[PDB]
Structure formats: C-alpha cells, structure tokens
C-alpha cells in the first residue's frame, strides 16, 4: 500500500541479456522510519507519516524538533501522507525501504517535472503555427482568435495559451521494477521519471497502468 | 482602446497601495569601528572586520 521516498538522480541505460538502451533512475532510499500512524480515532485518517534521510539539524526550528520529542529522530526531509488500510505498519521506527516490496510493477511516482519557467503559445496545448511570409505577415507564434462576437459575448474560462508549466505534482503510473535491493536500496525502473534530477519522489503502489 | 470613463482616485490609489520603497531592517553597525553602514557594503573607506583596507 504505502510507498517509499526515493530520489531521482539522472538517467542511464538499463542492460539485459540483450543489452537494451532503456532509461532508468537509480533511486536511493535511506530508511523510511515511522514518525506517526494516523488513526480512525484521530479523525477518519488511516495513514502514516514518515521521515526519510537526514537534514542539517542546526537549521531546523523548535516546533519541527518537538514531534521528535514525541518520536524518534533521523532529520527527515518532509512529512508525507501514505494511506493504507488496517495496520501492518506501526509507530516504532521501522526504517523500511524497497526490499519490502519486490513484486510491484505498477507504482505511482510523484516527481514535479522539469521546471523551466512558465512557457507561452505553442507550449500550452501546442497549437499549430500561423504561416510565415507566403501568406501571412506578423504572426508565427502570435495566437489567433479567442472568440466570436456578441454570442457568447465574452471569452470563456476554458482555453489557456500561457499558463504555468511544472513545479507542481504529476503522477505517471505503471513502471516495472527489475531490481530491488538492500545494499544501497537501489530501485531500477522502466524509466522516464519526472523531475529535474535529485528530486525526491514517492514510489507507492497503484491500481492502474 | 482609450478611456471611455475618466478614472476616479479609487482606481489611481488602488494601483499604488502596492507602491513601495526601501526597508532598512535597521542600518548595520560594525563591531570594529561602530560605523553605521548596511552590511556587505562599503562603510565609507572599506572598513570591515578590524581593517580599513583600501583606505578612503
């Protein structure tokens, strides 16, 4: 049910007997110990939160150290809701990692894609260009129309041409595994995971490819 | 196009609620000459820690 917090790093080949040139990311899971278990008695929750990796520990705040006077400590890099149903997971620092699972072949992933600013036209919904010089002048990436006249009277809320790209959650699904490990808790996937590199990312089972 | 109603200052002042200038957070003071500059900038003579370097 629960995921693990990995980290992106960057792409590489992933070789077979055949030696295929397929992308992959060598995900590094440090230990994901249990910070808390959320219960049906403390609202209608049934999730857990956890802590993965270290932080500086001289750059935290006292309210972000005082639930580690109610917990263990590992200097986590964030506190993340991982739903489950019933209890097979428990409040004690379990420090679990990818060895756990090993049959998993559909997993959600939530990197944030590559940030590169916000983009514009032909880079939202990827419009076909106007003509250059053999029929049109002064429009190339300059968007065309945006409505009719008095019906509808207005420009609808639908359509976008210049919204924001990335820097928000996105989820892939599928993604077979080839290796689960415990040496360095390395996880070799199908490939193409969103991010910008070194971008922390779940690796939680999913019900859909 | 252009103004079809002339604005009231309940349109002018509104855009200039968010007019802003400098904010000091106090001026910094050296611990070595008392000079009242802003930190990470020249005092008046390149006075930093226990020096007067490139003295002016």
């Amino acid at each position: 049910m629960i995921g693990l917090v990995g980290k992106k790093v960057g792409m590489t080949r992933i070789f077979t007997e055949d030696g295929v040139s397929i992308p992959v990311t060598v995900i590094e899971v440090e230990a994901n110990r249990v910070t808390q278990v959320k219960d049906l008695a403390n609202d209608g929750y049934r999730a857990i939160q956890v802590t993965t990796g270290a932080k500086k520990a001289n750059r935290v705040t006292k309210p972000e150290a005082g639930h580690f006077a109610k917990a263990g400590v590992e200097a986590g890099r964030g506190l993340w809701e991982f739903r489950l149903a019933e209890g097979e997971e428990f409040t004690v620092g379990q420090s679990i990692s990818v060895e756990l699972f090993a049959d998993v072949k559909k997993v959600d992933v939530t990197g944030t894609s590559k940030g590169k600013g916000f983009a514009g036209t032909v880079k939202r919904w990827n419009f076909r260009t106007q003509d250059a010089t053999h029929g049109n002048s002064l429009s190339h990436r300059v968007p065309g129309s945006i409505g009719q006249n008095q019906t509808p009277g207005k420009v609808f809320k639908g359509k976008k041409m210049a919204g924001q790209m990335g820097n928000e959650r996105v989820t892939v699904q599928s993604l077979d595994v080839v290796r689960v490990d415990a040496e360095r808790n390395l996880l070799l996937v199908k490939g193409a995971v969103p991010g910008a590199t070194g971008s922390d990312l779940i690796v939680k089972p999913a019900v859909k490819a | 196009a252009v103004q079809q109603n002339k604005p009231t200052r309940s349109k002018r002042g509104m855009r200039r609620s968010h007019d802003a200038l400098t904010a000091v957070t106090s001026l910094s003071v050296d611990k070595t000459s008392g000079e009242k500059h802003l930190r990470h900038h020249i005092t008046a003579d390149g006075y930093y820690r226990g020096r007067k370097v490139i003295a002016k």
């Binding site: 055949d18 030696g19 295929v20 040139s21 397929i22 | -």
Partner: protein, 121 residues
Amino acid sequence: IQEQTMLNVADNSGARRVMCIKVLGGSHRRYAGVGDIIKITIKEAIPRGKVKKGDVLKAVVVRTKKGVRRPDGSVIRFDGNACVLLNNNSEQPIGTRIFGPVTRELRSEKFMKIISLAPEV
C-alpha cells in the same frame, strides 16, 4: 519516410524515381517507410520493360532512409530508399532479382516471399 519522396527500385521491374502517393493504414503520418505497404505511382521506369510511366503500384520499402532500429545501441540505417513493387490485386513480389540488403520488418515475416529473392543483411 514521408509521402511524396522519390524512391528507388530495388527490384528489376522498373527504374528510378517512383513516388509515394499515400501512406496507408491511416493519415497524419510523418511516417511512410519500412515494411509497410504504401501506394506508389510509377513515373519513371526502364523503357525496355513491360510497363512504363504514370502507372500506380504498391510497394514495401526494403531499404528505408531512417532504416530500422531495435534499442540496444544498434540502429541499422540504410542510406538507400529502395523499395519493392507489388500487385494491387494480390501483392506478392513482382521482382525476381532484388539488389541490395533488406529490412528486418520483412524478416519479421510479413512477406515470406521477399527475403528469399533478396541477398544481403
């Protein structure tokens, strides 16, 4: 690759530029190559042959420009653009002698007739 383009005869049934006039199996393809069947228009041909110019046939490209590829760092790219002519009624190779090396989309065995007339890897 691409509709229009000016293709070679691999086979001995015509000669020179034979133009693609339809990418089959759908539309809006920037793709027109490989072992796929595609409607052709002969407008060059060998003049001692049996047909001439302005005819339509079909072909399978047998030496594609972007070639073929299987991920393992091996990309087999032919620099020819040569194709092999086929009946419109029945397909089946019209060549008997086939020059140059063939594609691995017809060594996938869509046409089991065309690898047995053609030399080379």
